[PDB]
Amino acid sequence: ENMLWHKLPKSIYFRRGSLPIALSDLEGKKRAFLVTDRFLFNNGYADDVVALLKAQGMEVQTFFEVEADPTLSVVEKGAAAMQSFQPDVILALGGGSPMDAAKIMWVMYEHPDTHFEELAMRFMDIRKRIYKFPKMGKKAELVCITTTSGTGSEVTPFAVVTDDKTGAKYPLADYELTPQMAIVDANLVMNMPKSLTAFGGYDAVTHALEAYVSVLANEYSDGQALQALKMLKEYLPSSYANGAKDPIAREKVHNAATIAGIAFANAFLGVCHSMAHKIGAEFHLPHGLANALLIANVVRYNANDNPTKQTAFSQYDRPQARRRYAEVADHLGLSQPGDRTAQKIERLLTWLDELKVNLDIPKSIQAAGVAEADFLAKVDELAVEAFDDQCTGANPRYPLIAELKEVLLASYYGKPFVE
Amino acid sequence: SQPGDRTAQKIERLLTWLDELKVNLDIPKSIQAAGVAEADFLAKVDELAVEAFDDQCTGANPRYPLIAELKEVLLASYYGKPFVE
Amino acid sequence: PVTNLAELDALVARVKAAQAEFATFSQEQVDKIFRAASLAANQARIPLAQMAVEESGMGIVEDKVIKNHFASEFIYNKYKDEKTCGILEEDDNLGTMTIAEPVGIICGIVPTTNPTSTAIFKSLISLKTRNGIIFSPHPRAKNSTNAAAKLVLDAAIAAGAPKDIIGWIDQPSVELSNALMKHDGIALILATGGPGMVKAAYSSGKPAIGVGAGNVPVVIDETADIKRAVASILMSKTFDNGVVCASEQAAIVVSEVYDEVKERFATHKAHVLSKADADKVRKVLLIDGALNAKIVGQPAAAIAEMAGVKVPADTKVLVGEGLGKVSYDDEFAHEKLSPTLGLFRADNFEDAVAQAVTMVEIGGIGHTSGLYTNQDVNADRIRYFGDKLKTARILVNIPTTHGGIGDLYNFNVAPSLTLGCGSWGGNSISENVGPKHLINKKTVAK
After folding, report:
1. Are the Cβ atoms of C62 and A2 closer than 8 angstroms?
2. Backbone angles phi, psi at C324, to 5 degrees
3. Cα–Cα distance, C275 to C293 (Å, whole number)
4. Is A89 helix (H, G, I), strand (E, B) or coil?
5. Where is the Alcohol dehydrogenase iron-type/glycerol dehydrogenase GldA domain (chain A) (predicted)?
6. Residues of A in contact with C63 (CB under 8 A)
7. Cβ-count burial of C129 within 10 angstroms (0-12 exposed, 13-18 middle, 19+ buried)?
């Protein structure tokens, strides 16, 4: 048989006005380094943290020179600056790139002798526990602050870094990348605008929905996945409509995002995540809504009775995805008491349809402002390059590149995918 | 222009020249082809035109525009239509 | 351009001087080339897979994509960091020093079944061992192979590699392949695929090892669960129309659990066959006595109609039961390399064992063997089964393929390829290949 997982960072401090009491316990430490973004650095947020540090008085410096993506260039200039400083504490601020880049630079600082490529190709995925990783955290060590509701990078031991010369994407993933320390306060995220709220919320929603039906879904993930899913359905529309006039829904959905981040940190992601990643990469589309336009077709792709064409090991652990969707729907009260599976599924995806309507997103990729000429030009290699992007992937039914383009064109055009 | 021409002949030659000249540089020919949602275009071209009037144009423009003509031009250009009367 | 023997020997001398200078390189610098090449190979798996599919004319793109990924990742990971340059072991107190040194020039023969994966495999291992290689691609699936060779060569070039180390034929011909096979300047040859070429490469008076496979039998007893065996065998056989090496070729079913297994195939895409269409397909499997090539990697419907029969389009494998006779003349007894299967009707456990043995000598190579049985109640069966069989791999309740849920089924297995032997005669248990076969060691005593 096989084995399976649940590993989390040790400590989370998380609320409304938690930040000062959160950082209070950081007395005995002396040095520090800060990573953040230039925009937030301009905003009156970094001053807050540096003042609270000077309250004890810490040799500190901020790095606000991270852009939307890890660079394989910014990472080592930051690592070199800090190893010149040699701090023992590292603080990450924001969402996505500032955090994982920090991770990278920190681990680069941890062993300033190991080169990048052997690390990059040695560690792509998990259950490949061959063989070992150099010890980290011996001299510096990681505390994390989220700002955006909708991403779980604060907790997952994941990173992806891009070549500047070729734009090559490098996924690095193994459990030591989890920060020791996580903080989830909401005062930072009260004025954030729509539909950026919608963007993050739908990103996290995708994460949870793929996590539950993942083939790696342990008994441990399902509870908090369904809890985040249950809580989202009442406080996303209010928070999208109301805020910061609604200081109830916003922090709550922030917590949902954190819960999802906890959830899929063990039950890995699926194909739709990879294709959203790519499509956003080429067309400069943000994540969070790139996947959102996909999921309907995705589930219509996944929801099948018994096509034993590329399914594997079908009958040992995964009973059926359709059953899983029906359980979610009826558990969500999204089904008439006397119902079959299929109509429960129908109600479920109709629910998410009217949901995404409520949060003001388009219905097709062309409706998003995407030309069809370059779309058809690039979709051929898009589907192929998406076939392999770590997706692989807890996807129960194996895909073939042919189906991918069909889904892609359906997405570009609308059109409920029913056979 | 042909050596034997009238003015308008030369004029259409002129703007034909510019037409497929700007064709040569791979640019959309209607602003919808430039990727603009047009429902709101119509919704908000109205005040767009009124500020388009007095925006310092004023303006060595030899002829007065009025609000109406601006609107005709804007819609024609968006659709790549020839503003002609 | 390489089409005649003149330019052939020209690039022979070229890559000879190239390897001569390449073999003086230090470990710490060949390592980064190793990493860069492995990464670049693993990047563009899909253009190569599409190229191979279109050039071959059959196969499944995604299987080739996934096997490219698995090949590149596994070959890099298992051979990340190994001491291969300079001194290897030392006894200073005795002054006895043992170093390693590369071999030189090798030829590589590429079949159409796996034209691109084997290419990157051999290329990367050669480059790791500071040696040179020339390719004999098959004329059918060649342009994909050549394109992969240029891509990996260029990725090496932008790493400080010499001007080239890689040679290959253009428009490959039997005369050029024999001229290079008997060329003086080559040190080793690596032949894989059809049995006709491997014996000829053996009959070369030169060092040679051939990675092959024979008829892979699986025996299923009564204490076996039917469903798990059926599902596993169907997935393994359906992988890429059964073109993977060391794939299943005949099934042994014991008496008591026979007809329910048969109808179990009837309950799925397996299309049973017991009539003159067994002959209609026996003709087309074995047209010349040498494995008719018009069925290579072809779907069940296509092979059924070319046999002369209609079959429901949803079917994937054709099940032959006219296999009461056990000998070479059985077309089913030969390996199929296609989504086709012939089964046996065994009497008991030991009759099944004897039939399995009679299968295994037909291949001539002891490569793999399958047992589907209850595990914890019959360990006597397990060890006796191991005693009677002589194959490199013994699997119990395990598919003879790669990839189930999660990591891999099984995660701790080498591919069905890479298992070759230095002989062909009989019971030649195929063995995996490593740089120990590809580097010569010398020692000095003081």
Report:
1. no
2. -60, -25
3. 23
4. coil
5. 9-185
6. none
7. buried
